[PDB]
Design a protein around this nucleic acid. Structure first.
Ligand SMILES: [Ca+2]
Ligand SMILES: [Ca+2]
Ligand SMILES: [Zn+2]
Lengths: 608, 320, 47
DNA sequence: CGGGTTTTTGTTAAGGGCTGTATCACTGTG
DNA sequence: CACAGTGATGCAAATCAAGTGTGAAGCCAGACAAAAACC
DNA sequence: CACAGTGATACAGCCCTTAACAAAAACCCG
DNA sequence: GGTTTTTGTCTGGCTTCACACTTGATTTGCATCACTGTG
């Protein structure tokens, strides 16, 4: 520090005289600007910005909200975050990140059961407490040895608490929507919220060791997402919000999770009864909640679409999927669906199913089994979940692709000329089709077909590669035209807005459907004479009506719940306690934090 | 910026003309010293320490080695790390984390094929190049239509290059081990290194779609671990570095990864024979490496213990 | 080696490019990086 | 009200170097 | 006796906020005065 | 039309050097 | 021995940081708990 003055003595004197006669007298500032000049000439902008930060207010320290957002959205675990915090702190000195306990204290604001709320008509059969979080999903079910045995573990939120937590999470999005819609900001009208409920059972989950019931290796998830929010102004309602990615993993919010078999109806009902109870209780009430200094009220309209075909059949009091009555929207037999294939109308509903079950149980006309089933149109159980008649886009695509795959297998051998075939011939057909598919379109043979397989197999190159193995040309042109018709029909029930981006396709859906039906019934009598798939029946009869009724198909699909299922295993393996009596609670909380949208605007703040 | 350049157009001229006289023309360092002395005259000591640290990359900056260490040992992917870096920079204003290209540049120091090494005697049938990296595990196997069909994907390192990188990754560890035993530091005695060889196949690995042969849904991994390093001192043999947790995932360094089936014998031999040839060549030679400013020579002894019974029987003889 | 097998399985989907041609090299590279004492010792900054 | 003076801020082009983003065939829950 | 997680909980320990009057240190002045590595 | 990754590579963008010129804002005083 | 560099000091006077006490009041660190996962 001392032995370096003899080299700057000659120069600092002119430094001060120049600063005095030109700048005014400051020396530190005139040297700072000079050193910034040198640095940014040398192209060391990183160190230049570091010096600017040191001289100005220090930027050290992140907010707990942004720390939690990083730790959650980078798929990080608590231990890894702790050691990253430790190493960063110990190396750089100043504490940049924040302690795990600070993150924990900062995360209760978004979990349900922290915000005050009330209902103008008090909700029936549910408490008015406002500090309820993760409660047991069994709802105090009798676990005594004298009762019906229980073998499930379930952790759940109250549905109203989940809704209010999500609403206060989306508070600022709702306010931004009010601003962008050219309305006011302090308006407190009756908000109408539309939510989607999705339920799908999972398999291949591995039960853990330890004390507990004889829990099965099948899991069932219940989740909800918010699609549309509308407020009334004058004589119309404005769209203050609309979900950008309705099928993403970031919009579905977990609500009730359990480790129970899908078809195990007794425990399914035992766990899902409370949620349906709250649903029916709050379907005719009004929620008053404080939003940024102004109280605002909320209505609720519920649409259930995220159920697959087996779930709908099971929970709507219907028979199995292989029954004569195929469609869960209309009362038509499989055969009659094969002769007509075009004209239908949706006539099934939850109340109609309930009264049909009442008729079935009471037998008020003194009829036999067959006559009573013909009277009830296939209802043999009491439904307990209310869903709207809708089509699941993902599974519709999967089923259609499977049927086309079978069509190709039977066409690469010309079964229309060989009505009788052995098992060996069909196995050879399978082998050659798989080999050529790999060779040409680079698809591996798989036993359970995915949606990527469906999207790739639903191309023109597919029928080209399949057809060059077909000796005849009539089959070539038939498959070509049928595939083109299917590809023209597809974009209607797969787009989030079929009324805007596909107007011509939506208008010509009916003509394409009729062409598809007549082509099947004429050229494919060897596959669709007396039997046709319920998914073809749906795609040819019910899609335009559902489009007109709802507005879109595919935004209400089960893709979001499938992505949540994907996340469930990852969280169970990485971000949850490995114990049988806490894992589901930890998974539920972490999934709620991940799907929370307050942690999501922090990760795209770079675009601001 | 332009106004500052306009106002200070000449002071730069005098300082640059005097830098050529007093020092030689390094304006950045002399101006840094001038700012430090200005702060000292203004009496700011902790701030002066902060500037000294940021120049030395201690108070902030997070030199790319540390960022890469976090990204790898924290199980963060490249995309997630990029999101973290972008959001941290956007919020804090400073550049706490290093960019992806900086991490990639700092990566090459650790990967095989960066350090110069010389063999004495030269290895039999092994090239003397010191820039070999990820080479195909098929070892130039024929893949034409007229010969045996190959349906495997394999990537592997050269054994000598992999061992050079492994030895240099623990350069400071070897120095510390030699210091802790009250030996010298620049000692260049022949190191007797024992390496455990481990190979085990797997099952239930899904095949991807995409270009490539009909590669089966099984994988076989070949990896090596470094147990003990000893140097010859005096009359006896002294130990330097012993692996504290030999059965851990932090010391099973991969050597050759092929996505084939261990039940098959032809493909196994075809992919694994060159590695055995390199091992046999290295079994009777010595390696010279510039180890921390002093050249030191290595000798290697190998033990293939990490095999299960079925693979042992299918490799070295007896029927399955 | 069993722990290495676990690391291989999770790196195959976590931090490796999804392509039959150029995935194995990425797995090998990342595993070599993860098994590096030079990187690992920066995670032990308590002394 | 407007020249006149002083200062700010940008512009022109050939190069160097750091940072940011699009593109490629694929995954995965189904 | 594999070993690195997996997160919530809880208690020991570190840091601090309040008050003013001290000590201790760094540095400014411009100038004079000894060690030390190449000829 | 599922949508958020997965990592390597290449190209675009932006900011420094030279030095003289040009569009523009703030007081002064006839 | 010359020459240049490298440190040393001088006293009055200025700013700048640490501390002297004490009583709570937080905030940070690290072990416990029964478990997974690759075989
Ligand atoms: Ca399912
Ligand atoms: Ca094995
Ligand atoms: Zn129908």
């Amino acid at each position: 520090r001392r032995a370096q003055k003899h080299r700057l003595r000659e120069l600092k004197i002119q430094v001060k005289e120049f600063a005095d006669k030109e700048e005014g007298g400051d020396v530190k500032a005139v040297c700072l600007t000079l050193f910034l000049l040198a640095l940014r000439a040398r192209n060391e902008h990183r160190q230049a910005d570091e010096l600017e930060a040191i001289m100005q207010g220090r930027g050290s320290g992140l907010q707990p909200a942004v720390c939690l957002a990083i730790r959650v959205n980078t798929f990080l675990s608590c231990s890894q975050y702790h050691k990253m915090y430790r190493t960063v702190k110990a190396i750089t000195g100043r504490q940049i990140f924040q302690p795990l306990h600070a993150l924990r204290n900062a995360e209760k604001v978004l979990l349900p059961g922290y915000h005050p709320f009330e209902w103008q008509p008090p909700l029936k059969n549910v408490s008015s407490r406002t500090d309820v979080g993760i409660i047991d999903g069994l709802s105090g079910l009798a676990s005594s040895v004298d009762e019906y045995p229980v073998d499930t573990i379930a952790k759940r939120f109250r549905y109203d608490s989940a809704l209010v937590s999500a609403l206060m999470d989306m508070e600022e999005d709702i306010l931004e929507g009010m601003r962008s819609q050219d309305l006011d900001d302090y308006l407190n009208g009756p908000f109408t919220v539309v939510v989607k409920e999705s339920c799908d059972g999972m398999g291949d989950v591995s039960e853990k060791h330890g004390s507990g019931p004889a829990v099965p290796e099948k899991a069932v998830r219940f989740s909800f997402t918010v699609m549309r929010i509308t407020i009334e102004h004058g004589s119309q309602n404005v769209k203050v919000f609309e979900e950008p990615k309705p099928n993403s993993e970031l919009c579905c919010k977990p609500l009730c999770l359990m480790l129970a078999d899908e078809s195990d109806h007794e425990t399914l009902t035992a766990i899902l009864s409370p949620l349906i109870a709250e649903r029916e209780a709050m379907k005719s009430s009004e929620l008053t909640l404080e939003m940024g200094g102004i109280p605002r009220t909320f209505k609720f309209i519920f649409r259930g679409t995220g159920y697959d075909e087996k779930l709908v059949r099971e929970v709507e009091g219907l028979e199995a999927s292989g029954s004569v009555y195929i469609c869960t929207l209309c009362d038509t037999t499989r055969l009659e669906a094969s002769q007509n294939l075009v004209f239908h109308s949706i006539t099934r509903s939850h109340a109609e199913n309930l009264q049909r079950y009442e008729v079935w149980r009471s037998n008020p006309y003194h009829e036999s089994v067959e006559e009573l089933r013909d009277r009830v149109k296939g209802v043999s159980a009491k439904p307990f979940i209310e869903t709207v008649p809708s089509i699941d886009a993902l599974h519709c695509d999967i089923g259609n692709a499977a049927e086309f795959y079978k069509i190709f297998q039977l066409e690469i051998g010309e079964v229309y000329k060989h009505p009788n075939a052995s098992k060996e011939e069909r196995k050879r057909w399978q082998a050659t089709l798989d080999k050529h598919l790999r060779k040409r379109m680079n698809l591996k043979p798989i036993m359970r077909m995915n949606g990527n397989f469906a999207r790739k197999l639903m191309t023109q190159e597919t029928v080209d590669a399949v057809c060059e193995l077909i000796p005849s040309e009539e089959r070539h042109e038939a498959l070509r035209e049928l595939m083109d018709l299917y590809l023209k029909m597809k974009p209607v029930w797969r787009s989030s807005c079929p009324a805007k981006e596909c107007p011509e396709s939506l208008c010509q859906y009916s003509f394409n459907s009729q062409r598809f039906a007549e082509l099947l019934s004429t050229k494919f009598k060897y596959r669709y004479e007396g039997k046709i798939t319920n998914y073809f029946h749906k795609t040819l009869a019910h899609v335009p009506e559902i489009i007109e009724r709802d507005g879109s198909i595919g935004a209400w699909a089960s893709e979001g719940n499938e992505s949540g299922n994907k996340l469930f295993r990852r969280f169970r393996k990485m971000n949850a306690r490995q114990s049988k009596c806490y894992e589901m609670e930890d998974v539920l909380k972490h999934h709620w934090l991940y799907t929370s949208k307050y942690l999501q605007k922090f990760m795209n703040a770079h675009n601001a």
